[PDB]
Amino acid sequence: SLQAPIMLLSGHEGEVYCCKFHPNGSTLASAGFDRLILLWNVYGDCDNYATLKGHSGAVMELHYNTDGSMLFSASTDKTVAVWDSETGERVKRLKGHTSFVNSCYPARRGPQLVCTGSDDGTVKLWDIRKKAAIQTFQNTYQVLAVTFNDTSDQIISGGIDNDIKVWDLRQNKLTYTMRGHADSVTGLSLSSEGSYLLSNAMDNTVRVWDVRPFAPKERCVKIFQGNVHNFEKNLLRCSWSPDGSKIAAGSADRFVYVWDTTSRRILYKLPGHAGSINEVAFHPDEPIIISASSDKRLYMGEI
Amino acid sequence: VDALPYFDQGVREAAAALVEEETRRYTDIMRNEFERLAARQPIELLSMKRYELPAPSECVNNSMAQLEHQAVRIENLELMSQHGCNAWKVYNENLVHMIEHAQKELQKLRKHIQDLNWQRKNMQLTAGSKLREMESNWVSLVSKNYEIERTI
Amino acid sequence: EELKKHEDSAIPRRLECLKEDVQRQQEREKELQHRYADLLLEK
Amino acid sequence: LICSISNEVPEHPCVSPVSNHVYERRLIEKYIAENGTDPINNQPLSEEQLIDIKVAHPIRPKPPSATSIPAILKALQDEWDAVMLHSFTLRQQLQTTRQELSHALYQHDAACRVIARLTKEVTAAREALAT
Amino acid sequence: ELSHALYQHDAACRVIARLTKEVTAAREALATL
C-alpha cells in the first residue's frame, strides 16, 4: 500500500477521459480534454514530474505496451502520438484518418502494431516503422472502441451500429458479429488471458464476451446492470483486474462501479466525484484504483 | 490427514470400519500392601463393636470407661453446640466462596474454546470456496479438451 | 488448541494441491484453442 | 480452595513460586522429599521455596455425636477405608487410560493408510476423465 | 491423546467419504465417455 488511502490528484484543467497504470505499477499517465499528458508517481507523494504536449485536440484514448516503454495516445485531431515512457519526446506521429480518432490499441507480444478507429467509418492498422497504414477496414459507421486479441490476429471493434464486429487480419473479411446491445458500444477491454472481453454500451448493460476458437455460438456470458449513460454521450471505458477477478466500468451518475467477475455482484460503488466518470483502472500489482472523471480530478482508492 | 469439519456440510460409521480394518492389519511403605489387599479382597477391617451393647451384672473398668466417655462427649458436645452454633454456618459460607471460583473457570474455558471453534469454522469456508473454484475449472478443461479434439 | 492446529494443517495443502491441479487444466484449455484457431489458417 | 494433589480442602495451604498452584502442606512436603521438583510443571522446587498462605483455621465443626468413642472407632475407620478404596480405584483408572490411548492410536493409523491409498486413487480417476 | 485421536479419526474418516464419491464420479464419467 502507498501513503494514505484516497490520494486525490488534481492539476488537470478540463475533462479527463483516460488514465493508465504503468506495467510495473510505479507511475501513472492521465489525459483528457486538456491537450496534455501527465506523468505522476503512484508512490511517495504522487507528484508531477513530466508534462507531455504535442496535440491540437482532445486526447481520447491512452494505452501502454507491456514493457512500460512506449506511450501511445489517440487524439481528436485525426492523429496518434507515439512517445517513450521516460525522457518525454515525440517519437512517432502517425496521421491517416479523415475524421476524429476515437480509440487506439497496441497489439501486445507481437511485432509492433496499433489499431485505431475513427468517425469516418474506418478501422486502420498501423506499423510504427512504416509511416503508413497497413490495412483499412471501412465498416460503414462511426467506430468508438477498438482492441486486439492476444494472438494479434483479430480486430475487435465497437461502433454505433449496436453490434461488436471482429475482423480477421488474414482473410480481411467480417468474421464475427456479436448482437446483444440495444445501443452504441462505447468501450472495449480485452482480458489478461485473452479469454474474455468486457464491453460498455449506451443501453446501460455491461457485457462479457468470450473470445475463443471454440464458441457456444451465443456468447452472452455475463450481464451487469447499474451502469448509467445519459445525455452527455461520453465515451465510457471498462477495465479488468490483473487477475481477472474484479471489473471496473465508468458511469455517468458519478459512482465508481466495480463488480465481482464470478458472482456478478457490485463489489464497490465508491463516491467522491462531482462530475461524470470516464475511466476506472486497476493497479497491476496491488488493489489500487485510479478513477478519472469530468470533474478534472483523479482518485486513488486503496482496497 | 485433512478433513474439513466446518466446511463439509454434506459416512462416519463407514469410514470408521475402513480405519478399523487398517487397525486389524497393524511407591509407599506397608500402607500400600494392606490397602491393596483390602480393596482386592473387598473386605473392610473390623472395628470395636463393644461399646454399644455391653451388659449389666471387668465391668467395673467398662463402667468407668463409660463414665469418662460420657463426660468427654458432654463437655465436647456442649462446646460443639456453642462451638457448633458459632461455626454452624461459618463453614457453609466458605463452601460458597469455593464453589463460585470453579464456575468462573468453567466460563474462562468456555470462552477460549468457543473462539477456537469459530476460528476453525471461518478458516474452512475460505478453502471450501477455493476447492469449488478448482472443480469448476476442472470440469471446464474436461469438456474443453474434448471440444477441441471433436473439431480437429 | 491442538484441534485448531490440526485444522490449520488441513487448510494449508488442500488448496495448493487444487491450485496446481487447476494450473494443469488451464494448459489443456490453452492449447486446444490453438488447433481450432489453425482451422482458419488452412481456409 | 482445593489442593492440587489429593483433592482436599486444605487446612494449611501453601503456594509454590515456580507454578502458581495451591497444595496442602503435608502433601507438597512429601513430594519434595520423594523427588525435589514441582509435581505439576516438573520444575525445580524445594521446601524453602514454598510460601504459606493464611487460612485462619479452615472451618471444620465437630459433629453433635462427637466423643472419643466414634472418633476412635467409626470416624477413623471410615477415613482409612476411604483412603484405601479410592487410591486402589485410582490405580485402576490409570492403566485403563493408558490402554485406551494405545488402542486409539492403533485404530487411527489404519485410517491414515486408507486415506493415503484413496488420495492416489481419486485424483488419478479424475485425471483419467481429463485425459 | 484419546480425545485428540477420536476427533481426528472421525475427521480423517470424512476425508474418505468425500474421496470415495469423487473417485466414483470419475468412473461413470470416463465410462460413459
Chains adjacent to D (≥3 CB pairs closer than 8 angstroms):
B, C, E
Q: Identify from E16, E20, E33 which residue to disrupt to test chain B contact, counting B C-beta atoms within 10 A and taking the largest count.
A: E16
* Chain E residues in contact with chain C using a Cβ-Cβ cutoff of 8 Å: 4, 7-8, 11
Phi, psi of A245 (to 5 degrees): -90, -25
Q: Is the CB of residue A114 less than 8 Å from the CB of residue A130?
A: no
Counting the structural domains of chain B, the total is: 1
Q: Does C11 touch chain E (CB under 8 A)?
A: no
User: CB B22 to CB D126 under 8 A?
Assistant: no
Dihedral over alpha carbons D77, D82, D83, D88 (to 10 degrees): 130
Work out how many CB contacts closer than 8 A connect A with B.
5
Work out how many CB contacts closer than 8 A connect B with E.
41
Which residues fall within 8 angstroms of residue A222, CB to CB, at 6 or more apart?
A: A207, A208, A261, A264
Amino acid at A51: T
Q: Does C10 touch chain B (CB under 8 A)?
A: yes
Q: Is the CB of residue A249 less than 8 Å from the CB of residue A238?
A: yes
Give A28-35 contacts, CB < 8 A, sequence gap 24+: A28/A290, A29/A62, A29/A64, A29/A71, A30/A62, A30/A290, A30/A292, A30/A298, A31/A59, A31/A62, A31/A73, A32/A58, A32/A59, A32/A278, A32/A292, A33/A58, A33/A59, A34/A59, A35/A59
- Residue indicated by cell numbers 469455593: B98
Q: Domain A1-303: state its class.
A: mainly beta
Asked how this structure was determined, the answer is cryo-EM
Question: What gap in Å lies between CA A195 and CA A137, rounded to an integer?
Answer: 24
Amino acid at A101: V
Print the domain residue range for D12: 1-61
Which residues fall within 8 angstroms of residue B12, CB to CB, at 6 or more apart?
A: E10, E13, E14, E17
User: CB D110 to CB B48 under 8 A?
Assistant: no
Q: D47-76 as b/e, with b when 16 or more CB fall inside 10 Å?
A: eeebeeeeeeeebebeeeebbebbeebeee
Strands A27-31 and A18-21: antiparallel
Tell me the three state secondary structure of residue A72.
Answer: strand
* Nearest by Cα to A91 from A60, A69, A122: A69
* Nearest by Cα to E25 from E33, A150, D63: E33
Q: Is the CB of residue A93 less than 8 Å from the CB of residue A82?
A: yes
Gyration radius from chain B CA atoms = 37
Residues of A in contact with B144 (CB under 8 A): 214
Q: Is the dihedral of CA A224, A228, A234, A239 positive or negative?
A: negative
Q: Identify from B6, B115, B118, B120 which residue to disrupt to test chain C contact, counting C C-beta atoms within 10 A and taking the largest count.
A: B120
* Chain C residues in contact with chain D using a Cβ-Cβ cutoff of 8 Å: 21, 25, 28
Residues of C in contact with A168 (CB under 8 A): 40
Assigned C-alpha cell, A121:
467509418
Assigned C-alpha cell, C9:
494443517
Q: Is the CB of residue A42 less than 8 Å from the CB of residue A21?
A: yes
Q: What angle do CA C24, C26, C32 make, to 5 degrees?
A: 110
Residues of E in contact with C2 (CB under 8 A): 4
Nearest chain E residue (CA) to B10 = E18
Going by beta carbons, is chain A in contact with chain D, meaning 3 or more pairs sit under 8 Å apart? no
* Nearest by Cα to D111 from E21, E1, E19: E19
**Burial of D20 (C-beta count, 10 Å sphere; 0-12/13-18/19+):** exposed
Nearest chain C residue (CA) to B113 = C1
Q: Is the CB of residue A22 less than 8 Å from the CB of residue A281?
A: no
Print the domain residue range for B96: 1-152
Q: Identify from B129, B135, B146, B147 which residue to disrupt to test chain A contact, counting A C-beta atoms within 10 A and taking the largest count.
A: B147
- Residue indicated by cell numbers 507481437: A110
Question: What gap in Å lies between CA D9 and CA A299, rounded to an integer?
Answer: 70
Q: Transcribe E10-23 into DSSP letters.
A: HHHHHHHHHHHHHH
Count Cβ atoms below 10 Å from residue A160 Cβ, excluding itself: 17
Dihedral over alpha carbons A48, A49, A54, A58 (to 10 degrees): -20
Would you tell me the crossing angle of helices B30-40 and D74-130 to the nearest 10 degrees?
Answer: 80
User: CB D122 to CB E23 under 8 A?
Assistant: yes
Residues of A in contact with C32 (CB under 8 A): 213-214
User: CB B5 to CB C22 under 8 A?
Assistant: no
Going by beta carbons, is chain E in contact with chain B, meaning 3 or more pairs sit under 8 Å apart? yes
Assigned C-alpha cell, B14:
463407514
Work out how many CB contacts closer than 8 A connect C with E.
7
E17 vs B2, B14, B146: nearest CB? B14
User: CB A171 to CB C40 under 8 A?
Assistant: yes
* Nearest by Cα to C4 from B129, E18, D120, E11: E11
Question: What gap in Å lies between CA B140 and CA B136, rounded to an integer?
Answer: 6
Q: Is the CB of residue A20 less than 8 Å from the CB of residue A281?
A: yes
User: Where is chain B broken, named by the residue before each break, C–N > 2.5 Å?
Assistant: 10, 26, 57
What resolution in angstroms, rounded to 1 decimal?
2.9
Question: What gap in Å lies between CA A177 and CA A200, rounded to an integer?
Answer: 16
Tell me the three state secondary structure of residue A8.
Answer: strand
Q: Where are the domains of chain A?
A: 1-303
Tally of helices (H runs) and strands (E runs) in chain B: 4, 0
